[PDB]
Ligand binder design. Structure first.
Ligand SMILES: Nc1ncnc2c1ncn2[C@@H]1O[C@H](COP(=O)(O)OP(=O)(O)OP(=O)(O)O)[C@@H](O)[C@H]1O
Ligand SMILES: Nc1ncnc2c1ncn2[C@@H]1O[C@H](COP(=O)(O)OP(=O)(O)OP(=O)(O)O)[C@@H](O)[C@H]1O
Ligand SMILES: Nc1ncnc2c1ncn2[C@@H]1O[C@H](COP(=O)(O)OP(=O)(O)OP(=O)(O)O)[C@@H](O)[C@H]1O
Ligand SMILES: Nc1ncnc2c1ncn2[C@@H]1O[C@H](COP(=O)(O)OP(=O)(O)OP(=O)(O)O)[C@@H](O)[C@H]1O
Lengths: 256, 261, 261, 264
């Protein structure tokens, strides 16, 4: 339900959300997997509607601590959706070309067009996250970006983009296990890079940056949802539920 | 299977391929779906390898007569593939922006990067198909493009791109039936009036497809003629050809350079 | 002389600016040409500094009624500037690709990078100008865009873009002569577009739209300048003066730092 | 005018071109400057036709040894050209995003459109130059690229692009002065890199790559011109002459009006 939408009152505190919380689903993994299968099928039908109607633009932003489940959320929640109408835009270390323009330039280029659903795998929020945590620009610079982001998203929404932002929220010990497993798994070693450790040493700074970002930019037109993500089955189910409910609210119809 | 690969001998004749041929699968519809499901899961694992290895580029080109099943092929063959590694680039009627540059400009911009598999829903070949059939440029112009394409694809492959080109081959009457289907129903939005103009030109299109295939099917960028009158056979055959191709790359997960605290 | 900078008090009135005003220059065309040549030489040197320092981004927006002199301003004001560091981005009728995204998508793509000076030949302001005058989207939509533009420009400025916006202001009788000239000159007829006459019939609505846009979006970090433009020599001189002074105000420095055998 | 167009016979030899050659212009520095001014103004006027006609695409390639004068040529040759029709595309060290595609991806994106003149400040040729000299890919890789480039440029020309490729040819001792003068000038030190020295130490391997590239890719649809570039006034004059005449050969026309009538 909507106990996970962050209200636009600037009173948000990340400690009020428990990464192991599963209270929204009355059951465990096995029943959730079945309910996910039902939601996934509705998602597929709604996506085909979105694409066919060709009017709405849908933007899903995914942010998380490292190993917080971004890849799994993309892979599982959107399984079976027509590839012609869903696109993943990943944002990594900015290139020199990208740093030569404002930080929103490379992000604005990737926004979804009419009839399209786009997933931001990481996003412009990295410019008030990692950029803040590692002081890649002075605080006086990034402090102003919360306003930039609110106004950029307001413009997107005003012009027809439905915006969903999900913070996949895992605990510190959960990250330790996933990072270790990533080491203890030959098919996952490629995902692990030593830089992952340095980011972990800053666990508390990142959590502070995430709370500030979420408090500052969760709006009626661009809400943040905090997703307890220690349980993959719960994470996938809750994201699917919110996404499906949002898409249903658009009242999309096939053209005559 | 390889009897469906157009050899680079310039002696391709499209009549030597039956739109209803299914001789490559020993069974019927139901047995094929079982093998297709097996191939699909094979496809998924190979995509995750491709993405993880981050070395090869894979370009799948889809061409067919209208209603020849390209949209269905994309939706069925790549069901369940991780969206982060599979991308569809569709090419429609060129804009003024795209016509102000060479015809390959808009196509080159969309090629797959390392670790990525890209589906061309239509391709640069439209510039030696519809462009030729409707004489949108003089033959003196487009007849040169067979070489451009051979060389453009040669450069892509030399630099690491695996190229598969599939012609989904249906019969004319089969087309009529499917077109009539499009009018009857949730799909009416897909139907176009220009489609009829193209239908009367069925023969000029078949000739262009044979010419393009004869001219541009190469060792580094082969054409496969896919009997596509049967969707279950079409999907199975394309899946089989692709999976073999990905298997031939012998891809391996990379390697690393210890206890997390 | 910042008598032409529109202050950010939302009080701007277009009627208080006379297109024939030349009061800022004590002289006429011949003396202005000499002052322009002096300013142009400084501009060329400041541009080389901008490029060499590689930190600031400079955006010059040009808007005007049709035949209001934007092409002439570009040609004359930027005569002799190194092509490696200045670039014109012109905005015409949005394509379907561009209309499928928010109106700022196609504009953001063209903003200047570090060390570069970009001229917007027309700009995002068309989306509260022609779009407003001809109701290309409902008033409920475009009325919201003044805020979008204020915040878009604020973000650009916060992140290092110096923004100058020039409204080249000609009178209605002046536009009649210049349009009539474009018809009577074989070297300019191609510039004449039949839509221009429709736009002329709406002269008053465009003036209203320009007044609203300028009142709504002239801010400290992104000022509008109203340029009396009936006199080309005065227009070119005044734009050069404002541009040069702005660039001088940035106080740009060449970057910091053995024999060759 | 005729003697600087590398013939498409694959026997091109660089040592048969003198960086100090000025034999194409009858005069000295001052007489060339006057002719350069005359060519410059025709260039301005021809560009306005190109832009207005909106049919032809014009691509000017500039390659040179470091400090060989590519920046100066752009600054001088195109001084006074309307920015609305002339665009410079610079190519530096590829980003990871650009390396994830074939080396021609980032270059093809920048080709000129109809009515436009584009200057490639460095180009796709760097992928058989610095890439070859420093073995950024195995010779097995970059050896195939001469073919790629001939065919890429053939496609461009067939589809309406006029291609001019200029190698600005300076001597090893001449480069030494410009690099030195680059240090001895507070307004130019920013241009000097230490990598400039490591590339200078490889002068001969670079010269060999240029001869190979020029011999392999000079064709009748995409000619290379070797420009004696030790003297700036001659370099600027010669490049201007070749460019202007080529533009004259296009026989560009102002369009016909839309459709005598009166304005109210
Ligand atoms: N604006 C930014 N400034 C600096 N670093 C950034 C920015 N945006 C993204 N990054 C960083 O880019 C890094 C790598 O992203 P990339 O997708 O290229 O690699 P990856 O191995 O797939 O990582 P992941 O799956 O965690 O995104 C991340 O650590 C992220 O913090
Ligand atoms: N280079 C080209 N020049 C002219 N027409 C082209 C070109 N490329 C594709 N086309 C034509 O444009 C149409 C494809 O446009 P688009 O992708 O918008 O179609 P659609 O309505 O989605 O359906 P479909 O693509 O399946 O036919 C086809 O009729 C094709 O022949
Ligand atoms: N956002 C927009 N919405 C609608 N029309 C627009 C928009 N932006 C620009 N235009 C229109 O585009 C036209 C300019 O087109 P373009 O620049 O391609 O041609 P042009 O002949 O050079 O015209 P001009 O010299 O007046 O700019 C103008 O009529 C202008 O009103
Ligand atoms: N394909 C390529 N592979 C490797 N290096 C390349 C490639 N293309 C260009 N470069 C190199 O990029 C370097 C930097 O050029 P850049 O345009 O970024 O800036 P610059 O300092 O102004 O250089 P310059 O004035 O010498 O052109 C040059 O040394 C050039 O050789």
């Amino acid at each position: 339900m909507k106990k996970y939408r962050v209200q636009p009152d600037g009173r948000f505190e990340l400690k009020r959300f428990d990464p192991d919380d599963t209270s929204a689903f009355e059951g465990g993994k096995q029943a959730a997997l079945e309910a996910l299968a039902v939601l996934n099928r509705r998602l597929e039908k709604l996506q085909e509607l979105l694409y066919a109607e060709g009017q709405h633009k849908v933007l899903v932003v995914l942010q998380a601590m490292d190993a917080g489940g971004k890849d799994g959320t993309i892979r599982v929640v959107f399984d079976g959706v027509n590839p012609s109408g869903v696109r993943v835009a990943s944002f990594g270390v900015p290139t020199e070309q990208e740093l030569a323009r404002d930080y929103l330039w490379r992000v604005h280029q990737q926004v979804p067009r009419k009839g399209e659903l786009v997933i931001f795998d990481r996003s412009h929020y990295e410019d008030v996250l990692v950029v803040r945590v590692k002081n890649l620009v002075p605080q006086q610079v990034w402090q102003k970006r919360y306003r930039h982001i609110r106004e950029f998203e307001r413009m997107l929404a005003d012009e027809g983009t439905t915006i969903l932002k999900f913070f996949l929220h895992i605990s510190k010990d959960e990250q330790r296990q996933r990072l270790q497993e990533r080491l203890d798994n030959p098919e996952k070693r490629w995902k692990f890079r030593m830089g992952d450790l340095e980011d972990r040493r800053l666990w508390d700074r990142y959590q502070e940056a995430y709370e500030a970002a979420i408090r500052e930019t969760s709006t009626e037109y661009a809400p943040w949802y905090v997703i307890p993500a220690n349980k993959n089955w719960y994470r996938n189910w809750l994201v699917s539920h919110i996404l499906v409910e949002t898409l249903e609210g658009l009242a999309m119809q096939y053209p005559q």
